Amino acid sequence: MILDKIVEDKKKRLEEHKAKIPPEEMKRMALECNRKTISLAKALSKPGLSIVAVFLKASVDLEERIKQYNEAVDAITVVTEEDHFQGSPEYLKYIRERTNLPIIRWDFIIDEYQVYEAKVLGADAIFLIMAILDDETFKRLYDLAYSLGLDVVVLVYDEEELKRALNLGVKIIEIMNINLKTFEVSMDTTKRLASLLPEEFRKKDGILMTIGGISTDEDVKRLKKAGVDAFVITEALMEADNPKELVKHWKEVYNN
Amino acid sequence: MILDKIVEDKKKRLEEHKAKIPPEEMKRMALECNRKTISLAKALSKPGLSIVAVFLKASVDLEERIKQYNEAVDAITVVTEEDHFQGSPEYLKYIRERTNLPIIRWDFIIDEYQVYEAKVLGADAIFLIMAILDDETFKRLYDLAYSLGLDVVVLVYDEEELKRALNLGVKIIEIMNINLKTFEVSMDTTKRLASLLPEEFRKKDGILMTIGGISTDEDVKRLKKAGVDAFVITEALMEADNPKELVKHWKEVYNN
C-alpha cells in the first residue's frame, strides 16, 4: 500500500533523471564544478541547541519563509523526493539561491548518482537511511559524500541500526522519535537509544539529532538531558507566525 | 517525514472518531447488531489463485468499478485510512452496499475500537500488521476479531515477523514483496520467506497471500511454485479496461 509504492516510484524517478543527465555526466559535473560547501557539522555542534528547519513543497510565500528561516534556524533540510512530497531538483535550486545556511538534501538516497547530484545541486549534506542500505552500500555512499566535501546525516530507528551505524564510523546520527510497536511518536525512543552511545561520542565530535514528538517546554528539557545537539522541525516552524521567537524560546529552555 | 506523520495523524483520527461514537457504544453495536459475515477464508483457499482487489479513494465511476470487480475478483480490500489515502467509514459503507464479496478493512488497526468498528461497518475481515503490534496486543486484537466472526489477514515483512506470526497461531499471512535493504519490490522476498513455512501450513488450512512486484506471466508462475494462494492487486486492476480478462489470464497462467 505504502512502502511498495514509495520504492517503485523512486526507481522510476531515478530512471527519468538518468535519461536527462546520464550518470557518467553527473559524475563529471560533481567533480569538475566549483562549490565550497557550508559546513553542516560546524553548525550542528555549536554550543546550545541547533535547529534544523524542513522545506517540504507538499505532502511567493516561499521567498518570505526562506528569509524568516535564515534569521532563525541553523540549517535547512530540503526534501527533493517527488512523488510523495512534490520536491524536485528545481525546488532545491530555488532555496539554495536564497539562503547561506547549510542545506541537507532529504530523499531516498540509494545510488551514487544522487550523491553526485546532491553536490551539483548545491547541498552541503545528504541524508542516508540505515534501514534501506546494506553495509557495503552505506559505506560506499557515506565515503563518497565525504570525498565530495559533503556531510552525512544518518537516520537510525532502533538499536541495531544504531549499532550498525556506530560500527561504520558515523558522526552525525539522527534518531526518529517513533516507536512502531506502540504506534507512538515519543522522545522515549531517542532517550533509550541515546543511552547506548559511547561516552566518547560527543568528545570525538559525534552529533546527535532528533525529529518528532517534541512540542512542549518539558519535551525540550528532555533533549538536553539526553545529549541531543540538534532538533529537526517540520510543521511547528511552517505554522509559526514568528519562527525566530519560537527558536529563541526553545534555545532558552534548552540552555536553562 | 513519513512514519512520524502517519502515526500522529492516526492517533488524532481515532480521537475524532471516539468523540462521535464513544468506545463503549461502538462495542455495544458490534455485539448487538446482526450481520452474517461472508467468509474470506473460504474465498481465499478455494482451488486456484484467488485475487483480492483494493479500493483506494486517493493517494459515479466507483459504482461501475465495483460491478466490474464483483464479476472478476474473489475478495475486496477497502482502505479506510483517512489522511494518507482519503478513505473513511462512509467509503467502506458505500462499497459494502454494492458487493457480496468478502471485504477486508485495511487501516492501521491498533485499537479494539477499530475491530468493533470493522464489524459494525460490515467488513468480513481486518488487516493486522505484525510490525506495529506487540505480542500481547496482537493476540488480543486477533482473538477479538475472530470472536466477532471476522477473519484476519496478518501482514509480515521479514523472517522474525513471520516467526512471531506462526508462533501466535496465525492462519492467513500476507507477505509484502519489498526488500528495504536493496530498495526493491520483488517476489524474491515472498520466495525466501515462504520457504520457512512449515509443511503442515496449507494442510492445517494456512493461507499465503502476496502483494507487490508481480506483473508478468513469469511472475505469476513464481507464485504457484511458492505456494501462494492469493494475490492482492491495486493499480493493475484499477487501470485495466477489462479486469475480468486480466484475472482470467492470471488464473490460467497459475493453473497451467
Task: Check B1 against A131: CB less than 8 A apart.
Answer: no
Neighbours of A2 (CB within 10 A): 17
Query: In chain B, which residue's Cα lies nearest the Cα of A81?
Result: B1
Of B11, B85, B131, the CB nearest to A180: B131
Q: Give strand ranges (E) for chain B.
A: 50-55, 75-79, 103-106, 125-129, 151-156, 172-176, 178-179, 184-185, 207-211, 230-233
Tell me the chain B residues in contact with residue A13 when contact means C-beta distances shorter than 8 Å: none
Closest to A125 (Cα-Cα) out of A176, A53, A77: A77
Neighbours of A206 (CB within 10 A): 18
Query: In chain B, which residue's Cα lies nearest the Cα of A177?
Result: B4
CB A74 within 8 A of CB A250: no
- The neighbouring-strand residues paired with A154 are A128, A173
CB B104 within 8 A of CB B123: yes
CB A128 within 8 A of CB A151: no
Query: In chain B, which residue's Cα lies nearest the Cα of A58?
Result: B1
Residue with cell 552525512: A152
Whole-number Å distance between alpha carbons of B73 and B236: 13
CB A108 within 8 A of CB A115: no
Whole-number Å distance between alpha carbons of A118 and A108: 12
Helix or strand holding residue B40 (H, E): helix B40-45
Task: Check A134 against B8: CB less than 8 A apart.
Answer: no
Tell me the chain B residues in contact with residue A85 when contact means C-beta distances shorter than 8 Å: 1
- The angle, 0 to 180 degrees and rounded to 10, between the axes of the packed helices B217-226 and B243-255 is 50
Of B2, B185, B211, the CB nearest to A7: B185
Closest to A178 (Cα-Cα) out of A216, A210, A154: A210
Task: Check A211 against B108: CB less than 8 A apart.
Answer: no
Phi, psi dihedral angles at B99 (to 5 degrees): -145, 145
Task: Check B59 against A5: CB less than 8 A apart.
Answer: yes
Full DSSP string of A110-127: -SHHHHHHHHHHT-SEEE
Query: In chain A, which residue's Cα lies nearest the Cα of B177?
Result: A4
* A18-21 long-range contacts, CB within 8 A, separation 24+: A18/A113, A21/A117
Closest to A92 (Cα-Cα) out of A68, A64, A125, A133: A125
User: Distances from the Cα of A45 to the Cαs of A206, A230, A231, in angstroms?
Assistant: 8, 8, 12
Whole-number Å distance between alpha carbons of A50 and A102: 12
CB B171 within 8 A of CB B153: no
**Cell triple for A36:** 565550497
Closest to A112 (Cα-Cα) out of A82, A96, A88, A133: A133
CB B243 within 8 A of CB B236: no
Residue B34 C-alpha, separation from nearest chain A C-alpha, in angstroms: 31
Neighbours of A160 (CB within 10 A): 11
Task: Check A181 against B132: CB less than 8 A apart.
Answer: yes
Strand A178-179 to strand A184-185: parallel, antiparallel, or no bridges (unpaired)?
Answer: antiparallel
Of A7, A182, A212, the CB nearest to B178: A7
Of A4, A212, A234, the CB nearest to B211: A4
CB B73 within 8 A of CB B40: no
Q: Which domains does chain B have, with CATH numbers?
A: 3-31+48-255 (3.20.20.70)
Full DSSP string of chain A: --HHHHHHHHHHHHHHHHHHS-HHHHHHHHHHS--PPP-HHHHHHSSS-EEEEEE-S---HHHHHHHHHHHH-SEEEEE---TTT---HHHHHHHHTT--S-EEEES---SHHHHHHHHHHT-SEEEEEGGG--HHHHHHHHHHHHHTT-EEEEEE-SHHHHHHHHHTT--EEEEE-EETTTTEE-THHHHHHHTTS-THHHHTT-EEEEESS--SHHHHHHHHHHT--EEEESHHHHH-S-HHHHHHHHHHHHH-
Contacts for B105 with CB less than 8 Å, ≥ 6 apart: B77, B78, B80, B92, B114, B118, B121, B123, B125, B126, B127
Of B132, B180, B184, the CB nearest to A183: B132
Closest to A159 (Cα-Cα) out of A110, A123, A129, A196: A196
CB B177 within 8 A of CB B208: no
Whole-number Å distance between alpha carbons of A153 and A76: 12
CB A213 within 8 A of CB A33: no
Whole-number Å distance between alpha carbons of B166 and B138: 12
Helix (H, G, I), strand (E, B) or coil at B204: coil
Whole-number Å distance between alpha carbons of A88 and A78: 9
Helix (H, G, I), strand (E, B) or coil at B53: strand
Neighbours of B35 (CB within 10 A): 15
In b/e form, how buried is each residue of B198-227, taking b as 16+ CB within 10 angstroms? eeebeeeebbbbbbbbbeeeebbebbeebe
**Cell triple for B113:** 475500537
Q: Which of A183, A211, A215 to mutate to test the interface with B (most CBs of B within 10 A)?
A: A183
Task: Check A133 against B8: CB less than 8 A apart.
Answer: no
Task: Check A178 against B1: CB less than 8 A apart.
Answer: no
**Cell triple for B127:** 488487516
Q: Which of A3, A7, A214 to mutate to test the interface with B (most CBs of B within 10 A)?
A: A7
Task: Check B4 against A177: CB less than 8 A apart.
Answer: yes
Rounded (5°) CA angle A56-A57-A62? 95
Closest to A142 (Cα-Cα) out of A157, A131, A127, A124: A127
Largest CA distance in chain A: 53
User: Distances from the Cα of A252 to the Cαs of A46, A245, A248, A255, B250, in angstroms?
Assistant: 15, 10, 6, 5, 63
Query: In chain A, which residue's Cα lies nearest the Cα of B213?
Result: A4
Whole-number Å distance between alpha carbons of A251 and A203: 22
A and B: number of Cβ contacts within 8 A: 72
Tell me the chain A residues in contact with residue B178 when contact means C-beta distances shorter than 8 Å: 3-4, 7
In a 10 Å sphere around its CB, with 0-12 CB exposed, 13-18 middle and 19+ buried, how is residue A19 labelled? exposed
Whole-number Å distance between alpha carbons of A247 and A240: 10
Tell me the chain B residues in contact with residue A8 when contact means C-beta distances shorter than 8 Å: 185
Residue A201 C-alpha, separation from nearest chain B C-alpha, in angstroms: 26
Task: Check B134 against A176: CB less than 8 A apart.
Answer: no
Residue B53 C-alpha, separation from nearest chain A C-alpha, in angstroms: 12
Per the entry, the structure determination technique was X-ray
